[PDB]
Design a protein around this nucleic acid. Sequence first.
DNA 1: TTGCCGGTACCGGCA
DNA 2: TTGCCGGTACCGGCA
Lengths: 60, 60
Amino acid sequence: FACVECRQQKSKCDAHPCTKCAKKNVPCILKRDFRRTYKRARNEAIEKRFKELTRTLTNL
Amino acid sequence: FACVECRQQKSKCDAHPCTKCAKKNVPCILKRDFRRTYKRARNEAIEKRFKELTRTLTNL
DNA sequence: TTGCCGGTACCGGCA
DNA sequence: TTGCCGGTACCGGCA
Ligand SMILES: [Zn+2]
Ligand SMILES: [Zn+2]
Ligand SMILES: [Zn+2]
Ligand SMILES: [Zn+2]
């Protein structure tokens, strides 16, 4: 299947340490139950929720 | 000089609406005093600071 | 102080 | 329930 890192970048993975994880020299894990993180949107949520906090601090 | 958007992506900008801002159809502002945001690192800070908050909630 | 190249990081979709 | 292309978004540096 696909290595954790490749799954994240959705890049072709040559395992079953994968090639890409080479150029990066990182822990090439094989977690068949891993699902990439949608960084962008994610951090968007965070920053949004983080904001609410301040508008809460300015009210307590 | 460079349009706000191009500065952000540090891409060649053809203004002085720029080309890129076309393919994107966005507000091609010319803010000579604008400086890109280092998204990555930035959101990193946010998420880190955001974290401290929870370890503070679990203590108040 | 500021423009952009060359090179990853991310992702919308389409299988 | 996934692998990955094709196309941006981001940036480390080098001017
Ligand atoms: Zn891989
Ligand atoms: Zn790998
Ligand atoms: Zn531009
Ligand atoms: Zn522009």
